[PDB]
Design a protein around this ligand. Sequence first.
Ligand SMILES: [Zn+2]
Length: 44
Amino acid sequence: GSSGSSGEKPFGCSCCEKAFSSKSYLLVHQQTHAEEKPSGPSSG
Ligand SMILES: [Zn+2]
């Protein structure tokens, strides 16, 4: 249906469905995926 993207975001993450405006931002965001990864023994 009628659905658009807020602001020009030609940059879209690969792991998630997030989008940014400037690569720089997207990059820093990727760092998160390099930590607290979901793949774990399941220990609080
Ligand atoms: Zn991401």
